[PDB]
Symmetry: D3
């Protein structure tokens, strides 16, 4: 049955004009935009919240700084097994066929974020879309 | 210099046929930047009727509004050199291959996309869709 | 309202692996396959009939020979204004954006045929699809 | 040498979503040749039930046949080095990006495409769809 | 008849990762690569030569600076009607379907140069590949 | 860290018009072209060198003949983790998502060579671009 998951199109996707490329990959796998906001600049604490479970990490600040270094889009996708399948679609820069595997080559600038659990999903959605 | 802003509507037939990223991608490939964007799961029939005010006396006016509310739409303010005209050309018409409608659309009504056609209608449409100015 | 038109994917489309490329262009413009046959080799008189209005032309024989020099696909597409709009989609090798304009560069090997009138349409369909 | 032939079905969800050329194109890009092709506007429920005989005792068997008759299908015999296995991998599954199903499908039932999985089921399926042998 | 033409993939193509995209359009139109040269920065002399006609124009200096502001690729293409077809393929920033039509939006940063005439083709080929 | 790697676009890429397609995949993964050479026919010496490890293998002669049976392009790519990422991008004819995975189907005619190691990368770059 349906799930929703949260996707962030990161600022590097704007710098490299891969926004539509990334969104189309999730679009062609038959997922739907239930919700979506463009942020010319995401307010920092939104980003910090979104990555709060990373607050103790070596990279936490640099990543938030990067995540704030350009536009981003937050999308709520709905579809069967959305969370897992979009996560897979995201992939990683070592796995060709996925978004990062095909278009990304950095440990921070990797184009996209996607929720990895029902709970991070539910959580991340409330962050970028509080009004529900 | 020539930096304009124009209003694009991704129409509901775009979503129905999963052509949304395809349409935006053509605009993205031509080097235009999203300045603002709003996803509407269903647009208020009010905003549609405003957007299309100049057509209020046309035979197609209500069928079209019906359609513009049949599904999601995305309103996008695009910015870049000579944006209005260039994006208007990118929209094209169902008769000219090479354009969005030319390649992708085949109806007088369900034509995937709207683009402002003048500095005047742009400023105004940007107004209708993003009241925050 | 609907029209049907007849499309031939020519043998050069098989040699150059542009079959799906061509069919997708007509597919993305929202036309439907109502009918379709693959011919590993089209019988010559089918080809000759199809081009019968060209029988007096300088190129008539060479073209039939070429049209017989590989597989072809005959498709009946249905859609609003099918005949005219697919014709346009076909285009010519001087008009970028069209099939020939983007992928073809010869006066004979031009990838695709599409009916240019309601009558040639009706006719060409009966040829490649007699069983109706 | 390794020249095999395999049977591909473009399923009806492919037509519904206008992904037919996309699917065939992936097979075309990998250098496989169409040996035969049949457009069915609606497949005889008989041929579907034969094609899926090995599944006759499965919970999904009838839902699936219902679906395989819900729209057009195209049956294609593809030929090329190591075709069965290679095209089977090209089909993949809805879990593996990079493949047809991986990139394009998201259902246990509506998965765009069928490919033979063995020399045995190939010869047989080629038989079911092209009796002319 | 069969001609050869000179294409320059300009540095914005590299900036925007459009090199393959550009070459791909010419490739798919069935034009062959006859020779080619990667230039991480083109000798300013060469650009000045290449754009000699333009030495009196306002945009001349600006253009040279840009033509040298990043890598370029110089390609010699061969094929039927190559000069004018590849010119058409190049197009302009107003009309979609073309390289510039689809991908460019500047009067100066326009991705690709293609010779526009029999003479200029000879001239330009000699500049970039003086070995013929 | 940042490496350089040697890619060869093999003659079947040219036969099948896949050059841009291949380069495009590497381009979109964000790898830069550091230098490049078009070869209408590669000197057989060069191929023999390039495939030196393989001098004892059954397929060695067959391969040399093919590697010389049409044009090739030799490219030096630079980028983070370039050798192994571009190797992954090259892939194999079994697993889709890769260049070979999506576009190739022969044990010998497989479109692209990419260096597989730090050493072979140095070696191969020296063969094709001995000027460094
Ligand atoms: C591990 C890591 C992550 N990041 C950034 C990019 C990651 O997408 C994000 C969270 O890291 P992580 O959860 O490891 O990646 P993923 O998004 O695949 O779950 O933080 C860095 O900037 N540097 C790093 O070293
Ligand atoms: C002319 C026409 C327009 N429409 C709708 C679709 C158009 O996008 C919208 C405005 O019409 P118009 O200004 O003619 O189209 P464009 O979007 O090219 O400016 O009205 C119809 O539904 N039926 C019609 O006959
Ligand atoms: C004019 C011409 C056509 N042909 C072939 C290719 C054409 O598609 C077909 C019919 O010619 P024509 O009707 O002129 O082209 P179209 O298909 O655009 O109507 O015959 C040649 O082989 N040589 C020629 O000189
Ligand atoms: C397992 C399964 C299959 N099917 C349908 C879709 C499959 O293409 C077909 C055969 O099943 P299966 O052999 O599992 O799939 P594949 O096509 O990968 O061999 O049956 C369902 O409708 N529901 C199901 O739960
Ligand atoms: C007209 C013009 C050209 N240019 C640059 C871009 C052009 O590709 C180049 C030569 O001009 P031109 O020959 O007009 O361009 P093309 O014939 O390639 O369309 O100089 C400018 O930078 N500014 C200008 O105003
Ligand atoms: C194994 C093998 C390789 N080759 C060719 C294709 C290979 O790209 C090349 C070198 O073999 P190999 O190093 O196995 O290929 P790669 O490491 O690039 O996958 O020789 C054959 O022609 N026949 C064969 O049986
Ligand atoms: Mg994580
Ligand atoms: Mg208007
Ligand atoms: Mg004609
Ligand atoms: Mg099975
Ligand atoms: Mg000029
Ligand atoms: Mg090796």
């Amino acid at each position: 049955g349906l799930q929703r998951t949260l996707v962030l199109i990161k600022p590097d996707a704007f710098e490299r004009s891969l926004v539509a490329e990334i969104m189309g990959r999730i679009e062609k796998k038959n997922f739907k935009i239930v919700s979506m906001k463009f942020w010319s600049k995401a307010p920092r604490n939104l980003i910090e919240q979104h990555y709060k479970e990373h607050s103790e990490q070596s990279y936490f600040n640099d990543n938030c700084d990067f995540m704030v270094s350009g536009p981003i889009i937050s999308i709520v996708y709905e579809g069967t097994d959305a969370i897992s399948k979009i996560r897979r679609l995201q992939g990683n820069i070592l796995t060709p066929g996925t978004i990062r595997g095909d278009l990304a080559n950095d440990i921070g600038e990797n184009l996209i974020h996607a929720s990895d659990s029902e709970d991070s999903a539910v959580d991340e959605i409330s962050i970028w879309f509080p009004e529900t």
